[PDB]
Symmetry: C3
Amino acid sequence: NNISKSAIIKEGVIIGENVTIEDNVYIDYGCIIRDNVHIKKGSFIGARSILGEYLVDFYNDRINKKHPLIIGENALIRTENVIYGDTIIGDNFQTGHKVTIRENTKIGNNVKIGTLSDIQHHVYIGNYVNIHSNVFVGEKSIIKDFVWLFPHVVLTNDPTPPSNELLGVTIELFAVIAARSVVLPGIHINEDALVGAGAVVTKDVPKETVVVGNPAREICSIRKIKNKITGEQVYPWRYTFKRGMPWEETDYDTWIKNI
Amino acid sequence: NNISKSAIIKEGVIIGENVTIEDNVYIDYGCIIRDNVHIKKGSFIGARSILGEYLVDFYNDRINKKHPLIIGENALIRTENVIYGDTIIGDNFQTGHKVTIRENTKIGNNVKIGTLSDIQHHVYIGNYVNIHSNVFVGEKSIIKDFVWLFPHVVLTNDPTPPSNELLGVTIELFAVIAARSVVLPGIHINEDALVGAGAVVTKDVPKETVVVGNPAREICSIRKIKNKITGEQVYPWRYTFKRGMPWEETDYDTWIKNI
Amino acid sequence: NNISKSAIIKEGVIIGENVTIEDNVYIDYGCIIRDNVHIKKGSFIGARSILGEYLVDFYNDRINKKHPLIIGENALIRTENVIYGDTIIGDNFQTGHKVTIRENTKIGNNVKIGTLSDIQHHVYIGNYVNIHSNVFVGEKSIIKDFVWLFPHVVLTNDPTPPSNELLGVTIELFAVIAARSVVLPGIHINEDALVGAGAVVTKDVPKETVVVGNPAREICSIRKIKNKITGEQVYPWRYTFKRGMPWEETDYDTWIKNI
Ligand SMILES: CC(C)(COP(=O)(O)OP(=O)(O)OC[C@H]1O[C@@H](n2cnc3c(N)ncnc32)[C@H](O)[C@@H]1OP(=O)(O)O)[C@@H](O)C(=O)NCCC(=O)NCCS
Ligand SMILES: CC(C)(COP(=O)(O)OP(=O)(O)OC[C@H]1O[C@@H](n2cnc3c(N)ncnc32)[C@H](O)[C@@H]1OP(=O)(O)O)[C@@H](O)C(=O)NCCC(=O)NCCS
Ligand SMILES: CC(C)(COP(=O)(O)OP(=O)(O)OC[C@H]1O[C@@H](n2cnc3c(N)ncnc32)[C@H](O)[C@@H]1OP(=O)(O)O)[C@@H](O)C(=O)NCCC(=O)NCCS
Ligand SMILES: Cc1cn([C@H]2C[C@H](O)[C@@H](COP(=O)(O)OP(=O)(O)O[C@H]3O[C@H](C)[C@H](O)[C@H](N)[C@H]3O)O2)c(=O)[nH]c1=O
Ligand SMILES: Cc1cn([C@H]2C[C@H](O)[C@@H](COP(=O)(O)OP(=O)(O)O[C@H]3O[C@H](C)[C@H](O)[C@H](N)[C@H]3O)O2)c(=O)[nH]c1=O
Ligand SMILES: Cc1cn([C@H]2C[C@H](O)[C@@H](COP(=O)(O)OP(=O)(O)O[C@H]3O[C@H](C)[C@H](O)[C@H](N)[C@H]3O)O2)c(=O)[nH]c1=O
């Protein structure tokens, strides 16, 4: 192991082998840090979380194989998060409570995953992605930058279950999936699209389009939407909302010029 | 601190500062009692729960600020509940497992919150409220006395997400929201209304009215409903159901005369 | 107690009385094994799980009554599962994380229950049943062999809530309930039926029938369904899918001849 003198490791913490904990990481009461886990500088790991959780192969003979987990700098991981090995999480990651993240998954920077969320294996999550409470993200899902998944959203992948050939969902830049929506396997949700709350999305959703219902149906251009309090046009949301975004201190247009 | 000699504190328990535990409180294995938490007499706190959980400001510099949490008398809090500071919970509170309750929230007396439920910040819950399994209660929601939220209900608050101006839902006295229903932001569910299972509630629901569907539509007066086993009129439910209610030992009419 | 010399009991484990742990059982960090729990040979019990969790009667006077829990051979129980007393689980059981299983419940062999699932009391689950992530199974539900419940499915039981007379759902052999579906009380889902994702099932679903929508409506024979990748007829699924099934090494027809 390699643990920094500035790291704060509370009691009850259990540490395995081939563990690297950088500078100013704080590991709260009772976490279990299994083998092959690397936590980058400045991170906070919440009470009782279990990092580098066992992949299936461990159970064959109870011998833990090597499946490195890396968590980027300055994470703010809340209590009891369970994160599998063979996964990579970028910088400035934040979570709510009791989140579960599987193996062979990649999560970008400045991503937020809320309480109870369940990220399966072989998932791709980009940067500045916001996944709220109890969202189910099935294997093979691809979530592009700036997408928002509201509470209780479920992204599926078996088109005619149970079957052998899975098709993951792809959610393109800035699309928002409102709460309690379920997306069917292999569907493409296009850029700046809006899936209304509770929808059952059975077909691809075209860019800048709003769909609602079971089955979801297109009701209009996202541009038609007016803020309910101020009467202003809302979407694309990048010009009306910037809390926690990279253009927070400027404006989208200037920011995107620079990138 | 101030801990009663009659309190039973199991092992693994971790206690912070400015903690007050009254008489005959029982704190099960491994709970973490962070600073500024007051647990009233007779309460049971389940294994591994974490009380007075850190608000966001702690993370600025890892210095825990003062945000008192008070839990009323005779709570029956199950395992692994996470409850934030700056919140008040009344007497005879009961929970299921792994419930999460945020800050700046107020919960009345004789309230029940089930397994996995997630109560966000700035929520108001009255008395004799029953929230069943895995209900998501968003910030600014106002839940009046005697309301029932069935498993997987989700109360939302961002009308055109992501946006800055939130509108909480208000659920009036005795209304029942059946399972897997989602309520849109700022909706008013009126007294004795019934939201049928799985509904997507997009408009206010008038008193004593039953709505179903996606989007929910009024189908009839709640009074039209017959018990499926006995054929008797069901609603208002206060005259047909009294298990755990304050008129349990009498009758509604006599009881309400007295209050 | 009766604990095998071959059992591996990690630290932090807490064991009560009248506990029997067979040969080659492995109990991971911090589990709490309350009284009257019998874990059969070869089982793995994940970190921080709590087995033989207290029934309601304990709380009367904080005296734990006798409600035996038995877990069959070779379980693979993941972290933080909470399992009540007065319940029986068969052999080769596997779970995801943070699953909750209530009392007076019976679970067969080769059953899988995923992350966050919540099994209430007085539930019946047969063999080779697959319950995926965050499924809510209400009391009195009867789930027959080979049934699949996809993420976020919810089986209800109070027909006109809150009421006193509950009616459990019955899911017959091999039926599949797709994700985010809710089934109303007392409904019968017949053999080899398919409930499409997100459905609101308000009426019995006839054998080999596919229903979709809110409220769910019959759209066709399950036999009409073609695999989306291969174009082949999918159902009954027993002839097209066999991963983890008892006819995995043979074929259904030969297998069922033998049983
Ligand atoms: C997409 C959305 C913004 C559109 O709502 P809207 O602007 O209020 O649409 P309208 O109020 O103009 O209603 C338009 C019509 O579509 C219906 N409708 C609106 N949203 C619907 C939905 N999610 N599902 C089904 N029907 C819907 C309305 O009932 C109305 O139908 P009607 O007048 O014929 O009876 C809204 O459905 C939504 O999803 N809000 C997000 C809630 C959320 O999840 N926030 C994040 C979590 S806090
Ligand atoms: C509101 C409720 C009681 C009405 O159910 P109901 O009395 O069976 O209504 P009916 O059986 O008379 O059916 C009336 C019509 O409305 C439809 N309907 C009933 N409930 C519906 C629902 N929740 N969503 C959509 N449609 C619904 C029925 O299919 C029928 O339609 P149809 O005959 O044209 O095909 C029921 O929907 C419900 O919510 N039960 C609560 C289940 C629950 O969540 N319990 C608590 C958790 S245990
Ligand atoms: C039942 C199911 C297989 C049928 O999907 P399907 O074969 O794609 O049906 P189709 O694509 O031929 O679409 C048929 C029609 O029914 C509609 N439809 C399909 N599934 C629907 C659903 N779940 N709810 C409502 N409508 C649905 C389609 O939109 C189309 O309507 P339209 O053409 O008039 O606009 C699918 O709904 C489903 O449930 N897949 C399972 C997803 C899942 O939960 N997997 C397990 C978790 S990974
Ligand atoms: C900040 C914080 C978050 N969380 C969890 C709760 C949620 O599951 C997840 C995100 O919570 P958050 O307060 O950061 O919420 P936000 O992601 O900021 O979402 C808000 O803004 C959105 C645009 C929408 O308007 C939404 N309705 C609002 O809640 O993280 C905690 O558990 N504790 C915390 O202290
Ligand atoms: C009593 C008890 C409750 N709980 C959790 C389970 C649920 O999430 C929540 C409420 O469970 P509960 O048994 O007290 O159920 P109730 O609130 O009594 O709801 C029942 O009555 C309602 C009218 C409806 O008919 C409903 N379908 C029934 O389950 O608390 C436990 O985890 N363990 C327990 O021992
Ligand atoms: C194997 C495994 C499962 N689990 C949990 C995750 C789920 O909640 C539950 C089942 O996960 P699983 O990988 O065994 O999935 P399966 O039950 O194999 O389901 C797959 O195959 C089905 C036919 C459908 O195509 C489905 N979309 C696929 O995911 O157990 C873990 O937490 N860790 C694990 O390592």
